[PDB]
Amino acid sequence: EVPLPQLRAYTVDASWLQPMAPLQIADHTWQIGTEDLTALLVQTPDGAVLLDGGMPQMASHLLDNMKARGVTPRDLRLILLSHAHADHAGPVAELKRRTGAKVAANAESAVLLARGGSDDLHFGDGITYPPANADRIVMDGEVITVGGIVFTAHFMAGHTPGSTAWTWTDTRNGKPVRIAYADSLSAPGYQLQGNPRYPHLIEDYRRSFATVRALPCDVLLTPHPGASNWDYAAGARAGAKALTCKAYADAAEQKFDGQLAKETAG
């Protein structure tokens, strides 16, 4: 009586995940994701690194744009992420099976990733996806370099205990551009206060706003493009009205404070 993959039935909005070929951001860094979800490929002589991937569908559309930008599965060396939620780490496992890639990630994003997003601090097992093992554990401020480009982890706990920001500089207009890929600072439906699964939640977000402000931030990009008023649907005017870390940050803190305000009502 009806298989296991026969149902199970996934609601899919045909408007999500509308693919898009590489949208260049700098000499070496491109946005190969989809239009509603960041996924930055940065190419290098030694290999290439991917920051975030999006949803689990996206693996083969990402792997496409990695060829449209001259990256073979073997040339994909390293995968970084922002946080280990299904819509940013979704395809990591598959890509690891299909590429030469390995994953670097902090201890708390590694655990969430390895249990596939299950037992989420706020969504339980609703948001469950294909688990992956991390190949390298990173410490706050640790630097990873690949063929000249230098990546720095900045922990910004909040959205996820393991929410990270990565920073690297590459050329572009010939001058350096200090690229801050900052994680979500959102808190959707989250019990903020007296949360037994995250007692320093308010404190952590608080320190993460400050962290994001201080980022070496010529160009901010966020995993949800619109979080920083990008619009990957405006050609070379994507980051035209792109926010700055200070702006992004003060924005989130302001909405956070408002969230908090309504929780402390009754």
**Packing angle of the helix pair 201-214, 245-263 (nearest 10 deg):** 160
The nearest distance, CB 165 to Zn ion, in angstroms, is 14
CB-nearer residue toward ligand 51I: 109 or 184: 184
> Angle at the Cα of 146 (from 145 to 147), degrees rounded to 5?
120
Binding Zn ion (rule: CB under 5 A), the pick from 35, 36, 87, 204 is: 87
- Please choose which of ligand 51I, Zn ion, none residue 38 contacts, taking the beta carbon within 5 to 8 angstroms, the exact cut-off set by kind: none
The footprint of ligand 51I on this chain (CB under 6 A) covers a number of residues equal to 6
The 56-95 contact track toward ligand 51I, x by CB under 6 A, reads -------------------------------x--------
Query: Residue 136: in which H helix or E strand, if any?
Result: strand 136-138
159 is an annotated ligand-binding site residue: yes
CA neighbours closer than 13 Å in the CB half-sphere of residue 127: 17
The whole-angstrom separation of Cα 224 and Cα 17 is: 12
The nearest distance, CB 57 to Zn ion, in angstroms, is 15
Q: Does 200 qualify as catalytic in the annotation? A: no
Q: Does 181 qualify as catalytic in the annotation? A: no
From the list 52, 120, 170, 190, the catalytic residue is 190
200 is an annotated ligand-binding site residue: no
The footprint of Zn ion on this chain (CB under 5 A) covers a number of residues equal to 2
- Of 128, 122, 125, the closest CA to residue 87 belongs to 128
The 182-201 contact track toward ligand 51I, x by CB under 6 A, reads --x-x-x-------------
Place of tokens 């390298």: 136
Place of tokens 């030694």: 46
Residues of this chain, 152-181, that bind ligand 51I according to CB under 6 A: 159
The nearest distance, CB 177 to Zn ion, in angstroms, is 25
Q: What is the DSSP letter of 135?
A: S
The whole-angstrom separation of Cα 80 and Cα 68 is: 21
From the list 75, 87, 170, 204, the catalytic residue is 87
Per-residue H/E/C for 94-118: HHHHHCCCEEEEEHHHHHHHHCCCC
- Please choose which of ligand 51I, Zn ion, none residue 99 contacts, taking the beta carbon within 5 to 8 angstroms, the exact cut-off set by kind: none
The nearest distance, CB 170 to Zn ion, in angstroms, is 25
Q: Does 129 qualify as catalytic in the annotation? A: no
Phi (first) and psi of residue 252, to 5 degrees: -65, -45
Phi (first) and psi of residue 107, to 5 degrees: -55, -40
Residues lying near ligand 51I in the complex (CB under 6 A): 87, 159, 184, 186, 188, 224
Residues lying near Zn ion in the complex (CB under 5 A): 85, 87
Would you please indicate which residues are annotated as catalytic (active-site) residues?
A: 83, 85, 87-88, 159, 190, 224
